A paper describes a structure:
LmrR is a transcriptional repressor regulating the expression of the multidrug ABC transporter LmrCD. In the apo state, LmrR shows high affinity for the promotor region of LmrRCD. This affinity is reduced upon binding of a drug at its drug-binding site, enabling expression of the multidrug transporter. LmrR is a homodimeric protein with the drug binding site at the dimer interface.19 Central in this binding site are two Trp residues, W96 and W96′ (residue 96 from the other monomer), oriented face-to-face at 7 Å from each other.
The LmrR protein contains two unique Trp residues, W96 in the drug binding site and W67 at a solvent exposed position, approximately 30 Å away from W96 and the drug binding site. Thus, W67 is not involved in drug binding. By our method, all Trp residues that are present in a protein are replaced by a Trp analog, thus making the system most suitable for proteins containing a limited number of Trp residues. It provided detailed insights into the effects of fluorination on the binding interactions of the indole side chain.
Residue numbers in the entry:
A (entry chain B): 2 to 68, 76 to 113
B (entry chain A): 4 to 113
């Protein structure tokens, strides 16, 4: 009953982007805030954040600066989150229709 | 929309088709086409690519179903492991939504 590793990575990506949507942040603060928001259950480790942030920065989704290193969501990242939400909204409607077409038949 | 994102979405849709009930490839494509109102017309070869991986991982299997109009179709089905993975996905993704809600609430506090 463990969550698949690929799925966990997808979830961790979403959580981190939503933290940075809250505001610019540093790794220690992010990990601490996620721990608080998860009632202590989700304790992310630095190594996973550094891997993820390197990719998000490469894809232009986030940027960084010294101010420890602070991270922020770019305009590209905000737009990408908007398009993802819209695209997954349409998927939710497809699944709803599959269920309704089932019950109808 | 990124190619990876489309693949993740196609995976979830196909698993949800099979959760509704066992089906064969032409039937699956038709049900997705109808449920997307024509917006998603999957090609067979993409399903075979995805189904090869899902069968390798024990998430789906296949069997021959005798058709009452004559002949046979290859049916795909979600396995007991596949059903459990979908249950854990729903629970863990639901929890992610709650964490994000909490991050926002903890934000407004200050």
């Amino acid at each position: 009953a463990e969550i698949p590793k690929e799925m966990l990575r997808a979830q961790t990506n979403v959580i981190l982007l939503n933290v940075l949507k809250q505001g610019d942040n540093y790794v220690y603060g992010i990990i601490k805030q996620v721990k608080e928001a998860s009632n202590g259950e989700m304790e992310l480790n630095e190594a996973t954040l550094y891997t993820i942030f390197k990719r998000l920065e490469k894809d232009g989704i986030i940027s960084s600066y010294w101010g420890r290193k602070y991270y922020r969501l770019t305009e590209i990242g905000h737009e990408n989150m908007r398009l993802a939400f819209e695209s997954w909204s349409r998927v939710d409607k497809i699944i709803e229709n599959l269920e309704a077409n089932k019950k109808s038949e």
